[PDB]
């Protein structure tokens, strides 16, 4: 066991400990097949994360649900082991991604530190990582020239230089909300070395029409409302390398990040 | 009570009554508000439905959850009242639509009589109600000349004259499947006097491209797969009259049927 | 007579004058009814055309067939007056249209200046005036929404965006040839403010089938060869506004132009 | 605004529109004093130029540098407004002349249509406008009997009847080239009703010696090389009516045309 490795949180510690910063907690059981296959991974995770832990305000913790059974009942633990993110307000989300490695847990903590809503930090202080793609740039990506995956967003505008520029979108109720979402997505995907890009569909009509985003190219009074679109570009493939975002619109970044991270 | 009005089903009747045809059952309690403002409406529904009940093989029934509390318990009745569609194989779906009127309930039975999957009847014996729309025809609907709502389907082909013609769709995994679905949709919506149409996007490149369906127009090597698109045209409106089907793909007709029927 | 108005050409200046550019010559007799009610219209024209004469390299000239009788004899003048188009190479055609006005004469030179064969200029340098019509565009024209006449060409292909694009036509020996003809037609008719358009029948199967161009819609092994079809659409009429080109196929643009220019 | 008046060119159509013919483009800003008295002159220019536009392959167009700020940065726009000539290969020259009227803009288009280098047309098909002036004729011009200005060229030869005759010039490396230049000058000045003339200095030794072109009069081994000289004759003036072309030799016609057009 690593030197400073902390004891599980218990009913004397839980609320006092979660009242500052972020916590990634392993609700585990000493009575579990898979949870002793997590334990040594956890401690190495903890050990390698010691430095960033200080600077990102994120702590890896544990709860033994046998020694704290009523604690785990309050937190409504359904399975073992269960990995969760808390902030000072309480539960946020679970980390179900498999298989659990030191790499995957570290990436997840880094990913979550860049969500401004988690510690209500200020997104304006940060740059958007989203890259301005002219039509030609986007076509190069799709010709198989990407060396990393690119989540690309498409907009009913011609004036977006940075994805967070102040812009007035016509017949697009969700466009402004999605600029916040897109910026958060760009920074979270940057940890996984997945690129992001934005396309001005008004300046790239033929490309956006061919791709099925033709409704973003032009004002029409038959469609009341339009939404920004998102698609994934796979690196170093010359065909079938373009995949539209499958789920519905969301104000949350999570669906888009996890889509961009899928193995295809 | 109407003259022939059957009394509620009981444990001596239930499984035996449901072994043939379709049943639309009102699981109620004699001591609850919504189930006593429903009660006379059911009797309205039943008596008006007598002639169709036999030719459509659908029965309106009721269950007193006091005299048959264990029945309602076995079927997992959660609320009162609960209106449900049953098969000889068992539960199919619930009728949550409000307000419950004699018109809405009759419409539902007629609609459900037209799902081939309910009684394993043969869809191939029926005409598709879907009408062939040229691009020009569709713009006329969208200029405000629709006198009824039109749910329209858009396809990556040019050869679709009847929506259920024998066709080979290229790079479209779901298309064959959705012909069955689109055909059922056209028939169920004919009950509510809602029209349906199909468009050959290959015969209509500019229209489908501008509509945001440009991927159906043409083969490209970057998209593995395309799927047919669905849009609703509101009748007699000259603007904001075109609304895309919002949810994801389904092989079930129901979301598409309900989207086409909801108030805008 | 207008100020700079030239004297008739005579045998000493005649062939060296026609040795450059295009010439429109009025072979007349001073003792002729129709040849002296042409005279002032000829002077109106010349003066009105002064500015265009320089940039188009077209000259209105005259020959007195009594004072240069051996000249008119060499050219085999049949009647008086006879209006002829010459290039440096010699005679080209006569202008038989009546009634002769300043407008008709101006139009004629402008029309002839865009025939590439007159002064062997190269058509590749020019835009085609023929506009791309999809099915909906064409049906709008025929529903009566055209405000000028439209001569329309119909083709066995789906790949024609500009009427002069590089294309490989299947089972159509004349199509490549007719592309030049059609381009010259579009530019000559543009002088008379008549529009021209082209239709891809492979992209508009049902519209073209209904119109009687079904042989262009699809490859078949019954027909060895197909040719492009030509039809005229009259402006501002809601019925009986479509007229097929009546004469045979020609590599010449003029039969097609003159058809498009008829009074209805 | 006139009926068919085109909208400004933008980054999506700009390079496509310029791929054919000549374009005279008004690069403007809506927040520019000078660019708002041009706007109505521009729309007038366009409307009266509609007919010649077709036959000369010359189009008036615009780019708003507020709505197309990056295009104008790519085009290196320095001031507003900036009127420019483009061919398919790109920028040619700017139109800096003031004050801009409908007449000056039209005249400029006609002049540019007669430059063989702009659309690479064939100058040999056209006549030279340059008139043969014997010594006496030129002395008449200079006595003030010219009724239009006369740009006159002086040549080391005795054999020039037409300025584009096939000739061997002695000790004049540039003479052949300048025959092309002088021919272009003659046709372009013909648009503005400025005459051109040519003089054989070998046939007119005293006039040519006296004007300072004595070097063109006879073969001498003092000078390696001689060049044809150019002078302007002002109309209806009896003195100070003779002006040497002030700048250096050019194979380009533009300087000679502009000097001949200067008001004194």
Author numbering:
A (entry chain A), B (entry chain C), C (entry chain B), D (entry chain D): 29 to 292
Sentences reproduced from the published study:
One of the yeast PDI family members is Eps1p. Based on amino acid sequence, Eps1p appears to be a four-domain protein with a carboxy-terminal membrane anchor. It contains two Cys-X-X-Cys motifs, one in each of the first two Trx domains. The second Eps1p Cys-X-X-Cys motif was also found to be extremely resistant to reduction relative to other PDI family Cys-X-X-Cys motifs.
The refined ND-Eps1p structure was used in turn to solve the structure of S. cerevisiae Esp1p Trx1-Trx2 (SC-Eps1p), crystals of which contained four molecules in the asymmetric unit and diffracted to 2.37 Å resolution. Indeed, the SC-Eps1p structure revealed a different orientation between domains and a different interdomain interface. The interface in SC-Eps1p appears to consist primarily of salt bridges, between helix α4 of the Trx1 domain and helices α2 and α4 of the Trx2 domain, burying about 990 Å2. The distance between the two Cys-X-X-Cys motifs is about 46 Å in the SC-Eps1p structure. The relative domain orientation is the same in all four copies of SC-Eps1p in the asymmetric unit. Another observation regarding the Eps1p Trx2 domain is that the dihedral angles of its Cys-X-X-Cys are relatively uniform in the four molecules in the asymmetric unit of the SC-Eps1p crystals. In contrast, the SC-Eps1p Trx1 Cys-X-X-Cys dihedral angles show greater deviations among the multiple copies of the protein structure. This observation is consistent with the burial of the Trx2 Cys-X-X-Cys motif and its lower temperature factors in all four molecules. In addition, the proline juxtaposed to the Cys-X-X-Cys motif is found in the trans, not cis, configuration in the crystal structures of both Eps1p orthologs.
